[PDB]
Design a protein around this ligand. Structure first.
Ligand SMILES: Cc1cc2nc3c(=O)[nH]c(=O)nc-3n(C[C@H](O)[C@H](O)[C@H](O)COP(=O)(O)O)c2cc1C
Ligand SMILES: Cc1cc2nc3c(=O)[nH]c(=O)nc-3n(C[C@H](O)[C@H](O)[C@H](O)COP(=O)(O)O)c2cc1C
Ligand SMILES: [Ca+2]
Ligand SMILES: [Ca+2]
Ligand SMILES: [Ca+2]
Ligand SMILES: [Ca+2]
Ligand SMILES: [Cl-]
Ligand SMILES: [Cl-]
Ligand code: NA
Ligand code: NA
Ligand code: NA
Ligand code: NA
Lengths: 175, 175
């Protein structure tokens, strides 16, 4: 498949988003992988990567992703298209809201990743986040199953539609 | 007092150890501070520091210490003597046992700290630790209240006695 979805998850929320995204892109278009069982080679096997990472323990990367970080740093993302997604709690962790999105961005961006999927901070109620691209945009899709679960369906659909356009899955696959 | 004990604690175990140490050394020899309520100056004020830090979320520094790290990195430890102590769970986190001891050591040692208080790994059963000083010594006192609470009383007493000798408290005060 042209797209490789790699995720990390402790309670299943980001695991579910990864599967919602694949279901929307079609399993023929996207492969789903748990970073916990993944290799450096798995990521290098795709030129379009969708990385899902929730934030835990006050601004930390999900443990499995944290374990993989030294390996991710060895990869060259120059020539690769990457979109980011992850979950967080904007009420209990208002000052660490989806920080991991910025942490992983800090790894793949300097290494060449062409990132697509920036998402507006509008509609969210948080105080601080390391996962911002600019003043009013997260660097990727921020999902909150604890405080705004009612908005997940709508959020995933538009973001997937959005990144398909930015990735041009229309042309790459058939045009 | 000449000795400043700075601890960070989530469930109070490291706080407990900090108080045992102060009590054994005597309040007139050591002060106790919670890192979450301390400033850069609070630490700089001492030439003998005992830093207590438990390891959480798979090898991560206790959240308050983690928040303080940037500040800790801008402290000159040249001329200061330091001892490290902390808690961990060697069974549920055998691959990350007391990793935070190594993490804080990695910050202070390059910044000139003279570390005392290395502790033998004998009697502990874990798979990996970033808190090692060498093959068979942790860089500081490792306490396990979850799996080896029956060893805590003696471990602390012996370690306090050890660093007292290493620090030369018998002389430093009036000899
Ligand atoms: C102990 C704990 C700490 C958390 N820390 C953070 C945090 O620092 N920042 C954040 O945005 N959300 C935080 N969260 C919320 C989680 O990221 C959220 O529940 C998410 O949906 C988990 O995704 P997962 O199932 O993929 O692991 C934390 C959750 C718990 C229970
Ligand atoms: C969810 C969780 C994660 C933990 N992660 C680690 C770890 O990575 N390494 C370790 O040695 N101990 C780990 N522990 C054990 C704690 O460090 C230990 O219980 C310690 O006594 C807590 O000290 P505190 O009370 O000062 O915060 C963890 C405990 C829990 C509940
Ligand atoms: Ca943190
Ligand atoms: Ca609501
Ligand atoms: Ca970790
Ligand atoms: Ca006890
Ligand atoms: Cl992190
Ligand atoms: Cl850390
Ligand atoms: Na694999
Ligand atoms: Na491929
Ligand atoms: Na951190
Ligand atoms: Na880490």
């Amino acid at each position: 498949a042209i797209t490789g979805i790699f995720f990390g998850s402790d309670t299943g929320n980001t695991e579910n988003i990864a599967k919602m995204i694949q279901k929307q892109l079609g399993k023929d278009v996207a492969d789903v992988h748990d970073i916990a069982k993944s290799s450096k080679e798995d990521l290098e096997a795709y030129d379009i990567l969708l990385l899902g990472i929730p934030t835990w323990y006050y601004g930390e990367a999900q443990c499995d992703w944290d374990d993989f970080f030294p390996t991710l740093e060895e990869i060259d993302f120059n020539g690769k298209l990457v979109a980011l997604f992850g979950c967080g709690d904007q009420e209990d962790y208002a000052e660490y809201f989806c920080d991991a999105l910025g942490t992983i961005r800090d790894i793949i961006e300097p290494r060449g990743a062409t990132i697509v999927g920036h998402w507006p901070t509008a509609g969210y109620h948080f105080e601080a986040s390391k996962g911002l691209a600019d003043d009013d945009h997260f660097v990727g899709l921020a999902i909150d199953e604890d405080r705004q679960p009612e908005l997940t369906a709508e959020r995933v659909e538009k973001w997937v539609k959005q990144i398909s356009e930015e990735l041009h899955l229309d042309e790459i696959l058939n045009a």
